[PDB]
Every structure is written in structure tokens, then in C-alpha cells.
């Protein structure tokens, strides 16, 4: 708990932050595409084709 609190760890977090952000994008777009989540997919231009 207290052992992971220091300058190196703040650097280590800063180093892996763009990566952990991009995996979130992979997870989200991945979930959105796999379920056909209409709420989000109504916004994207070519995927829009599902006229009720």
C-alpha cells in the first residue's frame, strides 16, 4: 500500500497512461461493435444504416 507511493511509481504510471488509455478505447469500441450498441452507433457516418 504505502510501498508503491514514490517518484518512480508516478513516473511508471505516467509511462503506461497513454497505453492504458488506448486499451480502454479497444475495450469500448470492441464492446460497442460486438453488441451493436445503437446509442453510440447512431453517431458514426457509414455504420448509421439501420433505418427503422
Amino acid at each position: 500500500l504505502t510501498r508503491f507511493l514514490g517518484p518512480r511509481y508516478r513516473q511508471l504510471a505516467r509511462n503506461w497512461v497513454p497505453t492504458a488509455q488506448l486499451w480502454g478505447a479497444v475495450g469500448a469500441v470492441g464492446l460497442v461493435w460486438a453488441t451493436d450498441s445503437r446509442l453510440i452507433l447512431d453517431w458514426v457516418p457509414y455504420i448509421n444504416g439501420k433505418f427503422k
Binding site: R3, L5, G6, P7, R8, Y9
Partner: protein, 105 residues
């Protein structure tokens, strides 16, 4: 030194007796859970202490199995419960904490 500090000491002697490892001839440090700091402290013990430790654990596991306890006179007295692991375990944690302070900068 104090009347109420003699009472904390008598409540501690009460708990010690209630814990009842002394009934199995064990010392307090015999009963510790074996983590990494602990494993190292056992490893760091001299020959005579390790051998005694082994026998005391052996004796208590034997009693545990046969569901017995030692005769009252042979119970480890609270006053003479030698905390043999203390300085070893304190040194191992000291060393760990340093490594951890170093791994921070």
C-alpha cells in the same frame, strides 16, 4: 511501574493463558504464520534455536493429533516465554523497508 500497567500485564497474562499454546508446550514465536519475512527469520536462526523450535513444533503437532495437552507444570509460563524470533524478524523487516524506500526514488 504502575497499578493499571500491572493490570494491562495481568490481562495480557490472562489472554496468553486463554490462547493456550503454552498448554501444548509452545512458545509464542512458534505459533507465528510463516510469511516471507518470517521464513527468512527462521532461516537466520542459530542451530540450537532452530533445533529446539523444530522439537517444540513436533511435540505440539503430536499432542494436537492425539487431542491431548501437556501436564500443568510443563506449560510455557508467560513470564519465561522467550521471544527468540523478535530481533531476527525485526531485522528482516528493517531490510525489506530499506529496499522498498530505495525502489521508490
Amino acid at each position: 511501574v504502575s497499578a493499571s500497567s500491572r493490570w494491562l500485564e495481568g490481562i495480557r497474562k490472562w489472554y496468553y493463558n486463554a490462547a493456550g499454546f503454552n498448554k501444548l508446550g509452545l512458545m509464542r514465536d512458534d505459533t507465528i504464520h510463516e510469511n516471507d519475512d518470517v521464513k527468512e527469520a527462521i532461516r537466520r536462526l542459530p542451530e540450537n534455536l532452530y533445533d529446539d523450535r523444530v522439537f517444540r513444533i513436533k511435540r505440539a503437532l503430536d499432542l494436537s493429533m492425539r487431542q491431548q495437552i501437556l501436564p500443568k507444570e510443563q506449560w510455557t509460563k508467560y513470564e519465561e516465554d522467550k521471544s527468540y524470533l523478535e530481533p531476527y524478524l525485526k531485522e528482516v523487516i528493517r531490510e525489506r523497508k530499506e529496499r522498498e524506500e530505495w525502489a521508490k526514488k
